[PDB]
Amino acid sequence: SALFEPYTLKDVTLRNRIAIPPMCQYMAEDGMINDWHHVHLAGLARGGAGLLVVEATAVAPEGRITPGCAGIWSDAHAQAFVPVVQAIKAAGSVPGIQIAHAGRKASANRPWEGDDHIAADDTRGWETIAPSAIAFGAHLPKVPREMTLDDIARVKQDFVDAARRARDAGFEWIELHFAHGYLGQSFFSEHSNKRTDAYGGSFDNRSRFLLETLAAVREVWPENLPLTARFGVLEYDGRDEQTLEESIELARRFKAGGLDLLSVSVGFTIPDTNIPWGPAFMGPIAERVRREAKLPVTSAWGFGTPQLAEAALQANQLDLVSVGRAHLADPHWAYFAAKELGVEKASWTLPAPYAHWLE
Amino acid sequence: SALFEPYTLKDVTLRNRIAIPPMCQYMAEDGMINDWHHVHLAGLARGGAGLLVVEATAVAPEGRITPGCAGIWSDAHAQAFVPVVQAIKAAGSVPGIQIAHAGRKASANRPWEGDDHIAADDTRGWETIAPSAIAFGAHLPKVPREMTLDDIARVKQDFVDAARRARDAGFEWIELHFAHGYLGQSFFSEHSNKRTDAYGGSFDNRSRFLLETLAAVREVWPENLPLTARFGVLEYDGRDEQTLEESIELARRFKAGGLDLLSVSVGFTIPDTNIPWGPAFMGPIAERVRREAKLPVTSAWGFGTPQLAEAALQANQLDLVSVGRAHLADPHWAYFAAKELGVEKASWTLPAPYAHWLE
Numbered sequence: 001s002a003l004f005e006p007y008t009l010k011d012v013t014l015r016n017r018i019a020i021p022p023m024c025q026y027m028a029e030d031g032m033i034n035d036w037h038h039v040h041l042a043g044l045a046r047g048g049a050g051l052l053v054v055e056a057t058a059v060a061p062e063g064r065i066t067p068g069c070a071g072i073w074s075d076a077h078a079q080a081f082v083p084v085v086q087a088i089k090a091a092g093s094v095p096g097i098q099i100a101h102a103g104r105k106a107s108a109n110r111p112w113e114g115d116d117h118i119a120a121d122d123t124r125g126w127e128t129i130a131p132s133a134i135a136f137g138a139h140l141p142k143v144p145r146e147m148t149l150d151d152i153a154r155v156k157q158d159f160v161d162a163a164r165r166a167r168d169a170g171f172e173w174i175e176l177h178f179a180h181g182y183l184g185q186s187f188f189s190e191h192s193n194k195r196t197d198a199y200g201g202s203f204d205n206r207s208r209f210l211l212e213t214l215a216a217v218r219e220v221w222p223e224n225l226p227l228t229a230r231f232g233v234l235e236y237d238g239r240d241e242q243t244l245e246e247s248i249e250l251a252r253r254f255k256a257g258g259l260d261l262l263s264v265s266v267g268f269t270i271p272d273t274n275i276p277w278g279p280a281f282m283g284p285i286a287e288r289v290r291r292e293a294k295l296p297v298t299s300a301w302g303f304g305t306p307q308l309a310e311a312a313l314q315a316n317q318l319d320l321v322s323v324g325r326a327h328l329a330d331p332h333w334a335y336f337a338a339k340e341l342g343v344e345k346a347s348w349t350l351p352a353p354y355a356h357w358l359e
Numbered sequence: 360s361a362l363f364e365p366y367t368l369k370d371v372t373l374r375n376r377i378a379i380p381p382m383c384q385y386m387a388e389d390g391m392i393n394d395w396h397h398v399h400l401a402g403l404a405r406g407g408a409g410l411l412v413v414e415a416t417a418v419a420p421e422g423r424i425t426p427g428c429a430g431i432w433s434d435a436h437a438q439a440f441v442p443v444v445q446a447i448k449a450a451g452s453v454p455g456i457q458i459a460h461a462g463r464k465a466s467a468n469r470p471w472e473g474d475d476h477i478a479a480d481d482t483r484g485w486e487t488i489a490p491s492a493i494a495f496g497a498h499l500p501k502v503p504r505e506m507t508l509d510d511i512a513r514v515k516q517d518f519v520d521a522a523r524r525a526r527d528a529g530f531e532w533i534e535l536h537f538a539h540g541y542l543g544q545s546f547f548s549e550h551s552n553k554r555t556d557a558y559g560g561s562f563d564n565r566s567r568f569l570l571e572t573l574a575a576v577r578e579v580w581p582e583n584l585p586l587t588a589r590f591g592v593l594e595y596d597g598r599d600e601q602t603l604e605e606s607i608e609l610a611r612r613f614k615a616g617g618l619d620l621l622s623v624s625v626g627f628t629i630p631d632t633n634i635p636w637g638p639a640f641m642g643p644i645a646e647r648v649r650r651e652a653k654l655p656v657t658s659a660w661g662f663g664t665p666q667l668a669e670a671a672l673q674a675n676q677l678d679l680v681s682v683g684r685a686h687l688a689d690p691h692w693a694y695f696a697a698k699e700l701g702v703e704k705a706s707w708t709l710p711a712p713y714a715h716w717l718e
């Protein structure tokens with residue numbers, strides 16, 4: 001089975017093509033992770049996936065989505081990851097991390113606590129920053145503060161520091177969060193970026209924050225460990241052909257700038273869209289990016305059906321299959337998938353104290 | 360659904376009728392548990408079961424089954440359980456522990472490392488003790504040393520110390536391991552107990568080690584926390600009606616001596632038996648013990664099919680359903696069961712960071 005073939009990128013070898021994508025847990029306190037995350041992540045690593053990408057981890061306090069978000073904006077925050085990284089490695093999975101800044105979508109409630117911007121008089125909230133002083137709208141009505149050039153320099157440096165910290169905590173894979181309407185995505189999109197300086201207007205200018213951040217991170221991130229990003233390549237906003245063409249051009253520039261793999265997603269930059277949700281609906285778009293940018297890709301949404309993951313790999317739509325919610329339902333999804341696809345000794349997807357009894 | 364009704368025993372309330380029975384992991388070193396067990400157990404607790412019973416934990420070094428077995432024979436061993444107990448509680452499951460002594464079946468290899476008695480010249484092995492100097496046979500050929508009265512007094516005290524330690528580590532439920540051919544079971548069975556002193560011969564004498572151990576433990580175990588035992592009530596050795604009659608009589612004496620619930624199993628005292636394995640095959644025997652001893656019971660073997668667990672409860676064959684291997688396959692089995700049985704808001708079997716997204 002294609003799903004259970006190893007994958008090598010730079011000096012890192014994944015034992016199979018199952019990636020667990022970043023999934024926010026909303027369980028940190030002042031950015032500090034705790035035994036929620038330790039047990040969650042170590043348990044997932046033991047379930048058999050080849051790569052486990054830690055949830056969106058804020059490069060700066062105001063770049064959290066919510067008061068429960070993980071952070072890596074100080075060395076103490078970074079050191080909290082060390083035992084978890086070591087546990088993921090002990091289980092044979094590759095530890096990755098997504099580093100992030102929520103931009104105008106920051107200062108929001110947890111999804112089961114309203115999912116909306118935090119009220120103005122709530123002591124937990126904070127001012128958001130963005131390319132331009134324009135609200136997302138809907139349940140995220142707060143108008144962000146327009147970033148100064150010094151704010152841009154500071155956030156770039158925050159990404160560099162975060163990557164340096166991730167490296168020194170022992171992560172073997174990094175993902176820059178340039179998707180989902182957060183800060184990076186919002187610099188790229190004309191919907192959110194109305195700047196008239198070097199960071200907005202033209203395609204080169206809208207690309208600039210993302211490319212400069214990638215280049216700055218590349219200076220501290222080891223050349224022998226995969227350097228990746230998540231990026232929303234279309235919005236389903238009636239401008240899809242134009243948007244995908246620009247997004248593919250940016251992917252070519254990312255590749256030229258050292259990006260090893262792109263996690264292909266949707267922008268979610270604005271609320272007024274019509275996304276055609278369905279199982280593996282991203283497969284064809286990911287394939288197009290892969291082909292036109294000649295860059296390895298992953299994508300997500302509905303690949304918890306093992307046959308669909310297998311089909312996408314066999315068709316060369318993707319290089320890795322990201323499986324999210326199915327892993328919240330069953331930490332041992334990889335074992336389920338191995339059984340479904342007829343892998344020999346499927347139970348040995350799991351460690352011996354489980355595998356011996358399930359064979 | 361009966362499976363999702365709470366259960367109260369003494370001062371402890373389980374949120375549902377799913378028990379995770381003790382399952383040896385063979386991952387400890389010199390009896391000390393480690394992050395294998397922490398993550399394993401905390402992850403199981405978060406999966407939704409009402410009760411999580413920690414694996415057979417040796418009361419003394421020679422009472423381990425294998426070199427990988429957990430122990431509780433010193434205060435340092437006990438203190439290693441404290442963070443795990445606290446994590447199980449934080450997840451809303453009741454933490455229990457099975458305390459044990461492997462008797463003649465001790466000094467064995469891990470199941471995936473031969474499963475047999477350790478060779479005589481292997482530096483990991485040790486002399487086994489038992490009621491009588493008679494080997495199990497088959498893959499456990501070692502002849503144990505016949506216990507002296509002082510050995511019996513010492514092992515009883517080892518059980519007391521283990522129970523005291525479990526109490527002080529924060530366990531809310533204890534299970535004495537008097538099943539599966541280990542020390543306690545082997546005192547009860549005429550196959551293994553050929554003693555002619557106060558601890559063998561008659562039914563009263565063969566019962567004596569078990570009853571004295573229970574009484575000694577009861578002196579240190581809080582009256583407001585469930586005091587339970589696992590006991591093999593028949594062997595499938597051609598003497599089943601006689602054996603079950605004696606075993607039920609012992610269960611009545613256990614109840615009279617403060618036992619709150621009996622986990623009903625098979626003896627496994629000798630190898631030459633013919634066990635009629637099948638889904639829920641223990642249900643009718645557990646029901647008979649429940650009825651004839653008027654004592655709550657649990658049992659195991661094949662209850663990972665949720666409808667079978669539900670049927671056994673509705674028929675009053677059991678009070679709790681023990682689900683073992685299905686939890687090694689899927690730590691979140693309780694969520695699977697809730698969906699299968701049509702429980703409203705089934706995803707909220709799990710904690711919010713999972714439940715919100717699976718609803």
Ligand SMILES: Cc1cc2nc3c(=O)[nH]c(=O)nc-3n(C[C@H](O)[C@H](O)[C@H](O)COP(=O)(O)O)c2cc1C
Pocket residue numbers: 021022023024025054055056098177179180230300301302303304322323324325326712716
């Ligand atoms: C609980 C949860 C939290 C998520 N947090 C993030 C995140 O931190 N970063 C990100 O890029 N995507 C995040 N996502 C998106 C997932 O990575 C993934 O793309 C999505 O769940 C679709 O895959 P699935 O159908 O397999 O769940 C999150 C999804 C879920 C369900």
Ligand SMILES: Cc1cc2nc3c(=O)[nH]c(=O)nc-3n(C[C@H](O)[C@H](O)[C@H](O)COP(=O)(O)O)c2cc1C
Pocket residue numbers: 353357380381382383384413414415457536538539589659660661662663681682683684685
């Ligand atoms: C990995 C493993 C280890 C076990 N270790 C113990 C143990 O520590 N104590 C015990 O009384 N039974 C032990 N058992 C028996 C289980 O508690 C249970 O009765 C058995 O697995 C049948 O239930 P199931 O069909 O749901 O797995 C073990 C079973 C397994 C699979």
